[PDB]
Amino acid sequence: NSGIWVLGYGSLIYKPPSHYTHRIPAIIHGFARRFWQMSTDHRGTPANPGRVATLIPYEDIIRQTAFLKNVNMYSESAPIQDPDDLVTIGVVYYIPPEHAQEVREYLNVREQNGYTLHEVEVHLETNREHEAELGEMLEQLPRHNKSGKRVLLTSVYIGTIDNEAFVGPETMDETAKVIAVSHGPSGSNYEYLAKLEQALAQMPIMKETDHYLTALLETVNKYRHHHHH
């Protein structure tokens, strides 16, 4: 078999697949990350479902007024004019052939709650070590005409707007109250958001932006420790 490239944009950024051998920062164009997937098994419960991350493609954004309004509200590029105006940061992992089959099965079970497997293009933000170890591969990837970055086809888990766990569109006030208090077998819903925002904030990817995630964390923090009990 071949190896696999797996894109992480939520908890896979800071709780990675097993056995990976490369981990590269990745610019995902044409998708917005939203906390519009409910979690009844990890970060919430059947009685009180949490919220976890999913990616919403441009082609779905432009099919509902509520989605288009929400992306413009939080984006510097408002009004969003084209798919490349939507930017989400993540990382891509390489799993070598010897482990790809087993890691795929682990990730399928880890993401069982409504995610499906897709293939998307990302722009790589490589460092010099990546360029030393993977230069022969990078030279064979196309360079994007606008960004000048190498473009890589990578697999990705996405809760599509059709899946049973999808709760979008949801206003930030409603999403933040749920994240502030939900808690499941994996831990608090708050930890999932806070670790994701920290893992992105601590990535050495500079400004060359969708403010949703930082706005969400700010709202969650205001609601935290102000529950009725």
Swiss-Prot record:
Reaction it catalyzes: glutathione = L-cysteinylglycine + 5-oxo-L-proline
UniProt-reported outcome of changing E111Q: Loss of catalytic activity against glutathione
Binding site residues for substrate: V6, L7, G8, Y9, G10, S11
CDD domains reported for this sequence: GGCT_like (cd06661)
Cell compartments where the protein resides: Cytoplasm; Nucleus
Example of a GO cellular component annotation carried by this entry: cytoplasm
Major location category of this protein: cytoplasm
Active site (UniProt): E111 (proton acceptor)
InterPro entries: ChaC, GGCT-like
Domain of life: Eukaryota
GO biological process: glutathione catabolic process
Alphabetical UniProt keywords: Cytoplasm, Lyase, Nucleus
EC number: 4.3.2.7
GO MF annotation list: gamma-glutamylcyclotransferase activity; glutathione specific gamma-glutamylcyclotransferase activity
Other observations noted: Present with 1300 molecules/cell in log phase SD medium.
Similarity comment: family membership: Belongs to the gamma-glutamylcyclotransferase family. ChaC subfamily.
Function (record text): Catalyzes the cleavage of glutathione into 5-oxo-L-proline and a Cys-Gly dipeptide. Acts specifically on glutathione, but not on other gamma-glutamyl peptides. Allows utilization of gluthathione through subsequent cleavage of the Cys-Gly dipeptide by Cys-Gly metallodipeptidase DUG1.
Protein known as: Glutathione-specific gamma-glutamylcyclotransferase
Organism: Saccharomyces cerevisiae (strain ATCC 204508 / S288c) (Baker's yeast)
